[PDB]
């Protein structure tokens with residue numbers, strides 16, 4: 001029972017302190033925790049460029065990883081408080097949404113990384129059990145674009161690390177400066193403020 | 202080898218944001234005159250006892266306490282995890298020497314929080330205290346850690362030292378517990394800002410200590 005995650009990898013809307021490049025850059029891409037090849041959880045399942053940025057849709061497949069997340073979610077207050085509105089409890093989808101709230105890329109496309117908060121602004125990670133559902137979270141998207149994505153989505157366990165790794169990668173995150181302000185930005189920007197979701201930001 | 206941790210539980214010069222966090226000097230000192238040794242845990246969780254409180258003392262600027270982290274099951278978990286933490290790797294500053302375990306405690310559990318009505322229930326290592334000034338300073342030597350705190354005076358340290366001259370591993374949890382509790386901390390708002398306020402308040406300039414704030 002895998003988990004999809006979707007978001008923008010790069011946001012044309014925003015000027016860095018760091019569209020042609022990407023569409024050209026196109027014609028098994030893996031997905032890991034925080035850019036650490038001993039921590040591959042699953043794969044990208046689609047990329048696509050649109051009116052406002054590069055958008056990505058990846059799948060989270062690893063039995064050992066998901067097991068940590070399940071166990072770890074059982075001992076989290078945030079998770080226990082559940083999600084909102086009419087959304088139904090999903091301990092695993094909520095704990096990811098909290099832990100790895102951000103997305104980042106490195107063909108020219110090396111891999112996609114789930115991280116606590118992303119390098120390039122506007123890169124909020126939306127988790128969920130259904131790919132259509134996660135695309136439907138982002139108002140800027142269109143159904144022609146979802147056609148681009150659904151076209152793509154419609155080994156063994158590659159996970160070297162363990163809880164301890166994750167435990168250590170987690171408290172690095174705690175010291176990234178003004179991360180919660182940055183994360184709420186990608187919210188009021190990519191519109192997952194509007195369509196309700198499992199996002200904890 | 203255990204790790205001591207020290208800091209303010211409450212600051213008299215500070216007005217709370219919640220009315221329920223009032224502890225002033227007259228109430229603290231009354232309780233100190235009141236009559237096991239108090240346990241130390243992670244986030245007020247009775248399953249996460251990592252050791253004990255070794256001393257408390259009312260002093261000019263507040264209530265201060267020194268605590269000891271003895272648990273081998275806990276410390277082991279921490280040891281394994283600092284092994285995989287970029288912050289730990291970057292390393293401490295100035296002339297300090299690397300202490301992976303000490304550094305990771307300083308990151309994960311930057312704060313102290315008292316549990317109080319035997320009116321002192323316990324003390325809690327936690328990622329940030331709701332009282333301000335509750336920065337938690339870790340180190341291998343009780344003295345050294347109290348020397349990290351400017352507001353303290355020899356008379357105050359003599360009272361402290363006189364309490365640390367006082368085996369049932371009490372920890373009942375695991376990495377999963379701490380994993381889940383960490384991503385809670387991620388969504389405490391104005392956390393890093395608040396820790397930094399704590400730093401400047403109590404003197405701990407961080408160029409003389411393992412604090413990571």
Ligand SMILES: Cc1ccc([C@@H](c2cn(C3CCCC3)nc2-c2ccccc2C)n2cccc(N3C[C@H](C(=O)N[C@]45CC[C@H](CC4)NC5=O)N(C)C3=O)c2=O)cc1
Pocket residue numbers: 034035103104105106113115116117118119120172173175176177179182287288
């Ligand atoms: C506000 C903020 C957010 C994030 C971070 C920052 C960070 C803070 N700490 C530390 C802080 C203390 C302990 C942890 N570690 C990191 C960190 C950096 C690199 C890899 C892993 C981690 C965890 N951070 C976090 C996650 C992912 C990041 N990147 C950079 C990479 C990147 O620049 N890749 C390039 C882009 C263009 C070109 C040249 C480089 N090609 C590429 O592949 N990228 C796009 C990312 O995924 C990243 O920069 C910093 C601040």
Ligand SMILES: Cc1ccc([C@@H](c2cn(C3CCCC3)nc2-c2ccccc2C)n2cccc(N3C[C@H](C(=O)N[C@]45CC[C@H](CC4)NC5=O)N(C)C3=O)c2=O)cc1
Pocket residue numbers: 077078221222244245313314315316317318327328329330331332385386388389390391392395
């Ligand atoms: C800026 C900020 C800092 C901390 C928190 C806040 C928090 C945010 N989240 C959530 C947020 C998302 C998931 C976790 N959980 C917590 C939380 C609370 C209690 C225990 C564990 C956790 C993790 N938080 C965290 C740790 C310790 C706190 N306490 C409790 C204690 C306390 O109030 N003890 C009292 C005082 C008077 C009376 C009734 C209670 N008698 C007592 O003994 N104390 C002195 C504190 O500092 C605490 O208030 C909130 C904001």
